[PDB]
Design a protein around this ligand. Structure first.
Ligand code: NAD
Ligand code: NAD
Ligand code: GDU
Ligand code: GDU
Lengths: 312, 311
């Protein structure tokens, strides 16, 4: 089928592109390189099945783009990704994550797109939830602007589903990690730890290091995207994680073990916007999509460290 | 208290301005006249307790404005109000209703504001609801971009409440009608019927005219805004309506009885985005705020028609 991936030059996006190409699809990648990198797609230069469009979802003529490329499925991964950045500038975050999503939906409903697969944030949309691991039936209760825009994105797509019959499902990942994740930002802790420890540069945890996240390997997330792209799970959000909690301190230890380096992080002050715990109930994804995470943290971390070691 | 009202040149907004001033508050009104009218505020020219700011919530320096005026409560009524327009231009609707709300919250949290009273849409946010009358416990299920943006506004304000402790409550009105509603606007059916029947111009219904709404008078809505502005109902939405259903067709008869003469409208195609039924459970507002509507449709229609006739 014809596929279009927004955020295609990014970590998850470029990985998804590779998978869709392997599955025999024609893929249009779309990105403005806000946080994505051309290097993530450079290996595709001579692949006729891939076309890249440099575009900002906030202002580009998405109607024209979709009219030309006629995707059957749009995988919407383009977003402002950093929780702290969303606190610092909530308007910008809302522009990219809400307005960008709205413009894309409005373009899509006009061009015969069958389905949009949205990227939510299973890690943050529930805020501090009533129970862990947290099912999709739990109320959204965002406590950062990033989380709020992700929620608003889902709701708008649900609206376009009612209005035009434009199908949607929402992939709501926990904390995704693996090869191609940028080690030089403030988000993407696995990447940050791996490269810093390989380079012998300082590392840090925040608060007392007891905050937990649910760490899910990129390939597993990509598989969920592909599964939900079919006429399955229409209208639904799916938590995409492992349902296991790892503390900041425990993560550091795991990455240090994989690197074979010291396990001696610095301790820095808490970050406003960051939840204390995150753990997803992944039963619905199993039931509806037949999806289960295959990669355990130890193995995923090893593969991530190797990515940094082999980097040219 | 010091109050700021966004959308103050509008129908509900200017009415709320009057109420707050009467209650002894100082008021800053803010509007860009997208749909509001200067005539709604012209009587305030000489009142020093009131200051008006011409500003667009999407682009204005809201931080500077709120820093200057230091409002304790912000009543947020500025919005793109038309469902059909939201379908025509979802991006614009989202810019005003979502981005505008986000910019206001971000300004408010930095400027010592105690509470934002948001205006949601009780009539539309539930979409086709699981029951009637519809309680606030019913899930939101918007079926127009307008409704979606209203829900998104609520959620962003709830977010700012968690993040910064900026208090918020959501007033979710049904179908508000009464004096100062734009007779020449695209929204406002009671205004449309009143204006047209007074002019002897044609009146029309969409679909087969079976679509129902909950008609709540402006003065009752304003009272709910006042009640919820206190330290009560934090983080909560309140349906503000009558809990009584009136169809597109049945309203026409009421207006014609008030105006006089003929009672025979046309019948045009349904419009994309418009729901079929709407009726709000108003129990929560009663229990929590002590709010009850005072004005019944017949009485409210008389008032509205009389107002329009006087011009
Ligand atoms: N990594 C995680 O833990 C995780 C899990 C849940 C949610 N997500 C979501 O996954 C998606 C991909 O994130 P990622 O981890 O690969 O990070 P990333 O930064 O590599 O991916 C985001 C991509 O979107 C692009 N982009 C940003 N703004 C854009 C705009 N206005 N127009 C066009 N392109 C734009 C960036 O340039 C980048 O390539 C995002 O929607 C993110 O919110 C990430
Ligand atoms: N009338 C109803 O039935 C009803 C009920 C539920 C919800 N609402 C909400 O009530 C509020 C008031 O609506 P109304 O019925 O008085 O209509 P209105 O059009 O008279 O009031 C809206 C006001 O907002 C102003 N405004 C719009 N965009 C603006 C912007 N970008 N910057 C600054 N000001 C801007 C308009 O100029 C106008 O004065 C709105 O938030 C509306 O969505 C209306
Ligand atoms: O140098 C660092 C960086 C981070 N952390 C810790 O690592 C964890 C994860 O932080 P990230 O910034 O890597 O990611 P987030 O938890 O902010 O991720 C959130 O945003 C993502 C988008 O980037 C996804 O949406 C995800 O679901 C959501 O939880 C936190 O507990 C943080 O304290 C450290 O200990 N040291
Ligand atoms: O000439 C007309 C115009 C409208 N209508 C009918 O009148 C009803 C009300 O339409 P309005 O445009 O007056 O208002 P909405 O129903 O669109 O109101 C919605 O948007 C409002 C904001 O403008 C509020 O948010 C409200 O809660 C929400 O239901 C509809 O059934 C419509 O079909 C007619 O019969 N004839």
């Amino acid at each position: 089928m014809r596929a279009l991936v927004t955020g295609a030059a990014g970590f998850i996006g470029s990985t998804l592109v590779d998978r869709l190409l392997a599955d025999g699809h024609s893929v249009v990648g779309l990105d403005n390189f806000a946080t994505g990198r051309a290097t993530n797609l450079e290996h595709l230069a001579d692949n006729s099945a891939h076309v890249f469009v440099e575009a900002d979802i906030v202002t580009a003529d998405l109607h024209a783009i979709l009219e030309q490329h006629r995707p059957e499925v749009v995988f919407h991964l383009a977003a402002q990704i950093d929780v702290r950045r969303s606190v610092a500038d909530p308007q910008f975050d809302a522009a990219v994550n809400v307005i960008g999503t709205v413009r894309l939906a409005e373009a899509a409903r006009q061009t015969g797109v069958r389905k949009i697969v949205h990227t939510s944030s299973g890690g943050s949309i529930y805020g501090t939830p009533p129970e862990y691991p947290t099912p999709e039936t739990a109320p959204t209760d965002p406590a950062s602007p990033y989380a709020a825009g992700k929620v608003a994105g889902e709701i708008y797509l649900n609206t376009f589903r009612h209005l035009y019959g434009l199908d949607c499902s929402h992939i709501a990942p926990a904390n995704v990690y693996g090869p191609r994740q940028d080690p030089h930002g403030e988000a993407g802790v696995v990447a940050i730890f791996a490269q810093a420890l390989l380079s012998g540069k300082p590392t840090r945890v925040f608060g007392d290091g007891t905050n937990t996240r649910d760490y899910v390997f990129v390939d597993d997330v990509v598989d969920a995207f592909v599964r939900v792209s079919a006429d399955v799970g229409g209208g639904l959000r799916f938590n995409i994680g492992t349902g296991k909690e790892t503390s900041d301190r425990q993560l550091h230890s795991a990455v240090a073990a994989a690197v074979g380096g010291p396990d001696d992080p610095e301790f820095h002050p808490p970050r406003l916007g960051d939840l204390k715990r995150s753990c997803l109930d992944i039963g619905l994804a199993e039931r509806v999509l037949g999806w289960r995470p295959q990669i355990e943290l130890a193995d995923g971390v090893r593969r991530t460290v190797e990515y940094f070691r082999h980097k040219h």
